[PDB]
Each structure stands twice: as C-alpha cells, then as structure tokens.
C-alpha cells in the first residue's frame with residue numbers, strides 16, 4: 001500500500017490539550033472565560049425555541065449571513081457590514097485572510113510569542129520575518145525606538161495580538177494610535193488579533209482599528225470573552241477587496257457557516273455586554289485573588305500582572321535559577337497535573353521556557369482548588 | 383498602502399451561485415435534496431429543547447465528538463469510530479485528508495469532471511495526474527481495459543465520486559468490487575467521495591469501502607441526501623494514522639466543531655433512513671416526471687438518466703450542433719434565468735461545455751414550474 005501520511009509537528013498548545021485535557025482536573029490554563037450552557041444563551045440572548053425552529057437548514061453565503069455580519073459590523077466595523085467576514089472561529093478568519101494577504105519575500109513584523117497560527121502563516125508564505133521583541137511593549141506602548149527600526153517603508157504587514165495570549169500585555173489608546181500612525185506612514189498592513197479585546201484591566205477597551213475603514217485586518221471571536229468557544233464563530237474586519245479574495249480558498253475548505261449557528265451568533269453579539277460583563281466580573285474576582293496569591297509566593301514565582309484578557313504567564317524562579325532547558329517546564333506541568341490534578345499550559349507553547357499560562361477566567365470555585373494544587377506543588381519542590 | 387490581495391479564480395460552480403442565487407426563482411439546479419427546517423429535524427430526530435439546552439458551549443475535540451463519530455462509524459465504518467473524522471461539511475474532510483495524503487510527483491488518477499475541490503488538491507500538490515475518462519464508466523463498471531492502463535503499480539491514489547455530481551453515473555456492487563481489487567493489487571489509495579451514496583436508482587446503494595478497514599479514504603456529508611446542507615457536517619472514513627496527521631492543519635484552520643452542532647448531527651445520522659427516505663421518494667417522483675419531459679423534448683435535449691443521486695446533466699442539442707465554445711452554455715443559462723426565472727448550473731462548472739446540471743431533489747411543486755420555464759425557453763430558441 002502506498003498510504004504515506006505527510007507528517008508535520010502539531011503546535012505545542014493544541015497537542016498539550018489533546019494529551020492532557022480530561023475529567024476530574026482543576027483547569028486553570030485557559031485563555032478564555034468559562035463556557036455558557038445553551039440554556040443560558042437562550043435566556044440572555046432572547047432566543048425562543050420557535051426562532052430556532054423557523055430556521056431552514058439551507059446554504060448560507062460566502063461572506064457570512066447578513067444578520068450576523070451586521071451585528072458584528074455595528075460593534076467592531078463602525079457599522080460597515082461589507083468589511084466583515086464571518087468564520088468558523090477566528091482560526092478560520094486568520095487562515096483565510098493571511099493566505100490572501102501575505103506574499104513570498106514580503107518584510108513582515110511579528111510579535112514575539114504570538115499565537116501559533118499567526119506566526120505560522122508568514123513563515124509558510126515565505127515572508128521575510130522580523131520579530132517585535134516582547135520587552136519593547138511596556139506601559140501601553142511599543143517602544144517608539146523599536147517601532148522605528150522594525151517598521152519602515154516597504155514593511156508589508158505588522159502582526160500583533162493585544163491583549164496578548166498568554167502574558168496579558170496590551171496597549172493604551174495612545175499606544176494603539178502611535179502603532180497605527182507608524183503603519184499608515186509606511187503603508188504596512190496592521191493585522192490586529194483582538195480575541196480578548198473586550199476585557200481590559202489597565203486602560204480602556206481598545207476601539208477596533210477595523211472601524212477606521214483603512215487597510216488594517218483585525219480578528220475577533222466569540223471564543224474567549226463571550227463564553228462561547230463551542231459555538232465556533234469568529235470574524236475578520238478588513239477591506240472588502242481582501243475579504244472577497246478569500247472566497248476561492250473558502251470554496252474548497254468550508255464553503256459557508258450554518259444559518260442556525262449564525263442566528264445564535266447574531267443574538268450573542270447583540271447581547272455582548274451582558275455575556276461578557278458577567279464573565280469579566282468573575283475573572284476580576286479571580287484576578288484579585290490571584291494577585292494576593294502571587295504576593296504570598298514571591299520567593300518561588302514572578303509575573304507581570306495581565307493588562308487585559310483572562311490569563312497571565314507566571315515565571316517559576318526555580319526554572320530561571322537552574323536555567324532552562326525548555327523541556328523542564330513541560331515536566332513541571334506534567335508533574336503538577338499528575339500529583340495535584342491541576343492543569344497549566346507549559347511556556348514552550350508560547351516561546352517562554354520558564355513560564356506557564358495560568359488562566360483566571362474559569363469558575364471561581366474551581367480556581368481556588370487549582371491554586372491550592374499549585375501552592376502545594378511549589379512547596380514540595382522548594 | 384501595501385495591501386495587494388492575492389487573486390485566484392473561484393471555481394465556476396460557486397461563483398455562479400454567488401452571482402445568481404436569489405429570491406423569486408425556480409431553482410432546479412442543486413445536487414442535493416431540499417433542506418429541512420430545524421422544526422422538522424427536532425421532530426424526526428427526537429430532539430427535545432431540553433437536550434439542546436443542556437449543551438455546554440465548550441471546546442469539542444480534534445477528531446470529532448465521540449457521539450457523532452460513533453453514529454457515523456456505525457453506518458459507514460463498520461462501527462470503528464477510530465476511523466472517522468467529523469468535519470465542517472465534507473469540504474473540510476476533503477481539504478484535510480488530501481493535504482495529508484498527496485505528495486508532489488505521485489501518479490494520481492482522477493475522474494473526469496470531478497467536483498472542483500477533488501480535482502484541485504492533486505493539481506495543487508504537484509501530483510502527476512491522469513484522467514479517468516467519463517466514457518469509460520458504463521453499466522456499473524469502469525471499463526476493465528481502461529482501469530488496467532490507468533491504475534498500475536506505483537499509482538498512488540484513485541479519486542472518484544459515485545454517484546457522480548452532476549451526471550448521476552455510479553457503480554454497481556460488482557463495479558465497486560472490481561475497482562477495489564485493482565487499487566488493492568497496485569497499492570493505490572482509493573479516494574471515494576460518497577456524497578450522494580444513499581440515493582441509488584439502478585443498482586443497490588454501495589456499501590462504503592471505508593467499512594472494509596483498509597487503505598481507502600471515503601467522504602460523506604449531511605449536505606446532499608439528508609436535507610441538511612446548512613448544518614455543515616461531513617466526515618472522512620480512513621485509517622486512523624491518516625486522520626491524526628490532519629490535526630496540525632486543523633489546529634490552524636477550524637480547531638474543532640461545535641458540540642451543539644455535533645449533537646444535532648449525531649441524532650440526524652441515527653435517523654438517517656427517515657430523513658433520506660422522505661426526500662428520496664420526492665426526488666424519484668420528480669425523476670419520473672423529468673423522464674417523461676425528456677422524452678417529450680428529445681429533438682432539443684439528450685441525456686443519460688441518473689443512476690444515483692438527485693441531479694443529471696441534460697445536453698442541449700443546439701449547443702452540440704453549433705459546436706461550442708464553452709461560453710455559450712453560460713449565456714444559455716443566463717438568458718433562461720433572465721427570461722424565465724429558472725436556474726440551472728452551466729456545464730462549464732463540470733467540464734461539460736454542452737450540458738447544464740438539472741437537479742430533481744427540490745420541492746415537487748417548484749420542479750414543474752422550472753421545467754415549464756425551460757420548455758418555453760427551448761421552444762423560443764428553436
């Protein structure tokens with residue numbers, strides 16, 4: 001038999017979860033807020049059984065159904081439904097638009113430790129990639145001296161995720177304005193993954209640069225702040241010409257979304273403030289508790305507190321002292337899971353060999369139990 | 383600004399529908415049976431509102447949820463849920479498995495006029511493609527003399543769709559057995575798109591070669607025979623080793639399906655006979671009527687009757703006589719739509735310059751109206 005499957009290494013993040021997600025664990029590893037049940041969604045978003053029952057299970061359309069596009073456009077595109085592309089999670093919006101955007105040889109600037117798929121597409125397109133160092137982002141701005149050297153005339157795209165999964169670093173409105181001015185000046189396309197945009201702790205929620213109506217591409221999803229990762233709805237906001245250029249790829253991958261899913265997503269987006277607000281309050285409750293926990297453990301752990309989003313990257317001092325290598329953090333996390341039923345994501349998934357992602361957007365009761373597990377574990381090793 | 387979207391030609395099929403689908407037309411162009419409403423699905427598939435309400439909108443898993451995988455495996459994989467991959471339509475299953483299966487330089491045999499995405503992936507992978515001529519498939523078998531020259535030791539894959547969209551040609555159980563014997567002998571992977579497998583008119587429904595438990599890849603979908611194109615659920619049946627090799631690609635495109643969608647799909651597959659049977663009876667009603675219509679129009683139209691599925695490819699004699707070129711059939715279909723509100727798909731979408739796809743799986747009332755439109759149109763031109 002000639003069957004010889006092409007093999008590629010899976011991203012560390014997703015493989016970690018395939019191997020270790022399961023029942024009876026304290027999962028304090030997520031970059032999202034814990035999921036709603038469909039009952040809660042129907043309640044909050046005002047979805048009578050009859051409205052679902054009326055949906056004819058027919059084809060939807062290439063760009064996304066008009067109702068859901070409009071709801072998203074009103075919140076993130078200044079009401080221009082023509083600049084919205086509705087997709088199976090933001091994962092699909094990323095795959096579609098970056099395949100259409102990026103060219104072999106293009107100079108592209110990519111945020112250090114960016115979400116795996118955002119780093120994958122420029123590499124795979126054969127772009128000339130320069131990294132934006134994580135240390136250059138501080139106090140709500142990218143160091144203007146760093147931005148000046150990295151983004152210059154001929155720079156094709158600048159690709160960032162703010163608030164950043166997993167560190168929670170983000171920009172202030174002033175920082176975003178300065179970033180947009182540099183990309184506009186050079187003609188670079190700003191590519192802005194706003195997965196956790198709706199939850200901001202230090203400065204205000206960043207207005208979607210997609211709403212400006214220029215040559216920027218931004219992503220959003222219901223997966224991380226809305227409690228709907230299982231709905232599989234995200235979007236890109238971008239010029240119509242880029243969006244339609246994605247259709248041939250969409251034609252041989254997914255075709256279109258379900259009108260039943262699109263109805264639900266439309267109602268969720270219309271009720272975004274209630275869905276997000278309830279989960280954001282719980283996350284901030286957990287965050288206040290996590291901050292106290294971190295102060296109590298400052299000998300064993302250090303961190304930058306998150307400026308946005310619902311996860312952070314604690315760094316374990318014992319891994320800094322012993323100094324690497326990357327495999328040690330994976331062992332650390334495995335042992336923690338084995339001995340204490342507590343799940344983090346090892347920093348190898350994000351280019352941070354000495355850290356792990358700790359999510360605080362899960363349920364408040366389970367959060368304490370996970371922290372107790374981590375506490376016992378750190379004590380045992382010290 | 384550097385924004386320069388990469389441009390590719392869209393498949394003719396999907397672009398035709400983007401330009402010409404709409405309200406107030408008689409659509410007799412589809413390769414599928416007309417969609418159920420969600421109300422009907424809940425009724426037939428026994429889905430209480432409470433079962434939907436219980437679904438937590440959390441992550442599903444890379445291979446597809448266990449319940450839906452099992453339901454599909456029982457019907458098409460001889461009960462081996464490990465050999466099933468559940469995907470966003472069969473479109474995604476095709477994209478995922480062919481990306482993992484096909485290698486540059488591989489000799490691949492591809493059915494003439496095959497569904498666009500099935501023809502795209504071997505071309506794009508840089509396979510060495512030989513075409514299986516449509517005229518070689520007759521009376522339920524591929525001409526053994528043709529199969530002998532095309533599929534030889536070192537042939538990597540043979541890619542076919544039976545029943546065939548748009549001609550409705552298919553194989554008998556004997557024809558399928560002979561095809562499988564030739565691929566098994568040479569070590570070629572049979573890739574078997576069974577989108578319309580459940581509706582067979584001349585011989586029995588073909589048992590899924592996926593159920594054999596060898597090195598074959600077969601696709602199915604809820605889109606064409608179940609009345610659920612808008613659910614966006616399909617699958618591949620294939621060796622587990624090929625399926626898991628798709629995970630890295632799935633990790634940067636769709637991640638996984640919705641558990642809410644997976645619940646519905648599981649119940650639909652369990653109630654497949656009722657969902658399919660009702661629509662199959664209506665299609666056969668339309669087919670009996672279409673056959674009489676074709677006899678009444680034998681001066682202007684010829685056809686091979688469909689052996690399976692719910693569409694056929696009538697050939698318009700006036701286009702044969704005047705002899706091409708391909709653009710004339712598109713004009714023909716446009717005029718038909720403009721003047722008579724009746725939609726076909728021009729044969730340019732399927733490599734058949736003188737034909738158009740005529741679907742008989744739509745509602746019986748709308749079917750007559752479409753045929754009257756086509757009749758008036760053919761008379762006008764004669």
Ligand SMILES: Cc1ncc(COP(=O)(O)O)c(C=O)c1O
Nearest residue numbers: 089090091115165195221223234
């Ligand atoms: C920053 C970022 N972008 C995009 C995604 C893709 O998620 P989805 O496809 O559920 O929208 C994720 C999820 O991990 C993420 O953390």
Ligand SMILES: Cc1ncc(COP(=O)(O)O)c(C=O)c1O
Nearest residue numbers: 471472473497547577603605616
């Ligand atoms: C033969 C064949 N295979 C696959 C597909 C993909 O459909 P879906 O993604 O809805 O399963 C189609 C739909 O046009 C088809 O006709």
